[PDB]
Amino acid sequence: EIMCMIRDFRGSLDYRPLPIDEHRICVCVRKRPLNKKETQMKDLDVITIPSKDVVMVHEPKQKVDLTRYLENQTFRFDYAFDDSAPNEMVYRFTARPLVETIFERGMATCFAYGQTGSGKTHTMGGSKGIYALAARDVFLMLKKPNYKKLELQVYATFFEIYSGKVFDLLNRKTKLRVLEDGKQQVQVVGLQEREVKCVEDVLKLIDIGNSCRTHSSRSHAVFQIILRRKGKLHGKFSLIDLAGNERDRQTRLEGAEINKSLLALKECIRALGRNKPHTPFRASKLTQVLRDSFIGENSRTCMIATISPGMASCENTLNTLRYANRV
Ligand SMILES: Nc1ncnc2c1ncn2[C@@H]1O[C@H](COP(=O)(O)OP(=O)(O)O)[C@@H](O)[C@H]1O
Ligand SMILES: [Mg+2]
């Protein structure tokens, strides 16, 4: 009944799924498919991405006279990825253009933002996750004649921000202090920086930090790819798998700290587009550590808003699209 109403509406859509456009700030949405449990649990798919560009939310509702209808809210982003877009498709329009940024000596960031279960970690971490696909392209760019002559070295860090504090995912969640005030470069004191020479070196670090992290839904994981000349910084790509945006004492603290930081993040990304001097990067630990990825002269950012398609997730989806729409 509700399912027919949905099928009858999709049948009217012109499916034109996803040529790279340049954005200083790139905001995108990615729908994940219904999983094997949801599929046998009868649950319904309330989200359609018919176009390169467009997200449709069509929530089934029923009136007091028993009339059923679809509550249709449409959102427009730089890109939208349907539930069968693979990681490499998503990567191409998002993190891939930013790899050139860091060789041109810029600071790049890529955030995965959305509810727990929606696909942030699938997108960023997982050989087919965004950390690794970027790492691949970094080592390939490095062989190009412009960059071959530079004597560049590549390093990686993997850390988390949990409850307003930093912990090293490459060193057993050891708590680290951050020194920001008056420093030319923000210093995360004691943070393990590891030289990597191929994708395989990076996959090992991602595997290590992920099992350290896993709590994984209540912290931001930051993976960094760092270019260095002679120990001197050439560029940095920071890749962020954010804490779930969905909203006892420890639990309330984590959520208050998460949401504080997502407000700060939005303001900082917007400052990056309009007014870098007015970047409120001190509003959270997440944005403080990344100060220089918002205020640097050649700073570029990307956000992938991940959404679950289920009717039961609908309110959460709308909150995610709303926030992404306002960045
Ligand atoms: N686009 C996708 N295609 C296939 N499976 C996915 C996709 N996105 C997420 N999943 C799967 O759904 C589950 C939850 O995803 P995850 O990325 O762990 O969510 P989050 O990090 O947002 O909590 C995992 O089992 C993951 O493999
Ligand atoms: Mg996750």
- Collapsing DSSP to helix, strand or coil, 285 comes out as helix
122 C-beta closer than 6 A to ligand 1: yes
Tell me, in angstroms, the distance from the centre of ligand 1 to residue 123's CA.
8
Q: Which of 173, 177, 137 is nearest to 154 (CA)?
A: 137
End-to-end CA distance of the chain: 37
Domain 1-327 has CATH 3.40.850.10: yes
Ligand 1 within 6 A of 306 CB?
A: yes
Amino acid at site 238: S
Element (H, E) at 291: helix 291-295
Q: What share of the chain is helix, strand, coil (3-state, %, to 5)?
A: 35, 30, 35
For 228, other C-beta atoms within 10 Å of its C-beta total 17
Residue type, 160: E
Q: How was this structure determined?
A: X-ray
Q: List, as one string, the DSSP characters of 32-60.
A: PPPPHHHHHT---B-EE--SSSEEEEEEE
Are 119 and 126 spatial neighbours (Cβ–Cβ below 8 Å)? no
Measuring from atom 14 of ligand 1, which residue has the nearest CA?
117
What single string gives the DSSP state of each residue in 134-163? HHHHHHHHTTSHHHHTTT-EEEEEEEEEET
* Any atom of ligand 1 within 6 Å of the Cβ of 31: no
Q: What is the DSSP letter of 309?
A: -
Specify whether the CB–CB gap between 47 and 53 falls below 8 A: no
Q: Is 201 in contact with 236 (CB distance < 8 Å)?
A: no
Determine how many CB atoms are found less than 10 A away from the CB of residue 197: 11
Helix axes 199-213, 130-141, angle to 10 degrees: 160
Q: How far apart are alpha carbons 267 and 280 in whole angstroms?
A: 7
The two structure tokens encoding residue 245: 């945006």
Supply 176's token pair: 């680290």
Residues 6+ apart with CB under 8 A from 285: 161, 164, 165, 166, 178, 261
Token pair, residue 5, equals 């109403």
- How many Å apart are CA 158 and CA 223, to the nearest integer? 4
Taking CA atoms, 166 is separated from 176, 247, 253, 255, 292, in Å, by 6, 22, 15, 16, 17
Choose among 102, 115, 125: nearest CA to 292. Answer: 102
Pocket mutation for ligand 1, best pick of 32, 113, 215, 241 (most atoms within 8 Å of C-beta) = 32
The CB of 216 under 6 Å from ligand 1? The reply is: no
Q: Are 155 and 147 in contact (CB under 8 A)?
A: no
Q: Round to whole Å and give the CA distance between 157 and 168.
A: 8
The tokens describing 149, both together, are 């002559």
> Is the four-CA dihedral 280, 284, 285, 286 of positive or negative sign?
negative
Distance 42 CA to ligand 1 centre (A): 19
Contact call for residues 310 and 35 (beta carbons, < 8 A): no
What's the CA angle centered on 170, arms 167 and 172, to 5 degrees?
60
- Answer yes or no: are the C-beta atoms of 206 and 131 closer than 8 Å: yes
Length of the chain: 327
Task: Give the integer Cα–Cα distance in Å for 324 and 114.
Answer: 9
Stated resolution in angstroms: 2.3
Residue 242's contacts (CB-CB under 8 Å, 6 or more residues apart) are 111, 112, 113, 114, 120, 220, 262, 265
119 alpha carbon – ligand 1 mean position (Å):
4
One-letter amino acid for residue 181 of the chain: D
Q: Which of 246, 243, 244, 218 is CA-nearest to residue 315?
A: 246
Rounded distance between C-alpha atoms, residue 263 and residue 97, angstroms: 26
Q: What does the alpha-carbon distance between residue 228 and residue 205 come to, in Å, rounded to a whole number? A: 19
Place of tokens 């859509």: 13
- Long-range CB pairs of 175-179 (<8 Å, 24+ gap) are 178/285, 178/288, 178/289
Distance from C-alpha of 174 to C-alpha of 192, rounded to nearest angstrom? 10
Neighbouring residues of 6: CB distance < 8 A, sequence distance ≥ 6: 44, 45, 46, 58, 60, 70
205 CA → ligand 1 middle, Å: 20
What is the full DSSP assignment across 183-244?
-SS-EEET---EE--SHHHHHHHHHHHHHHH--TTSSEEEEEEEEESSSSEEEEEEEEEPPP
Contact assessment for residue 134 and residue 143, using Cβ atoms and an 8 Å cutoff: no
- Residue 10 CA: distances (Å) to CA of 2, 35, 53, 63, 77: 13, 20, 17, 22, 20
Q: CB under 8 Å to 196, separation ≥6 — which residues?
A: 135, 154, 155, 156, 202, 205
Q: How far apart are CA 41 and CA 64, in angstroms?
A: 27
Element (H, E) at 302: strand 299-307
106 Cβ closer than 6 Å to some ligand 1 atom: no
Token digits of residue 168: 């090293």
Q: Which residues pair with 58 in a beta bridge?
A: 72
- Cα(121) to centroid(ligand 2), Å: 4
Three-state secondary-structure class, residue 92:
helix
Contact call for residues 165 and 148 (beta carbons, < 8 A): no
Ligand 1 binding pocket includes 121 (Cβ within 6 Å): yes
Judge contact between 306 and 30, C-beta under 8 A.
yes
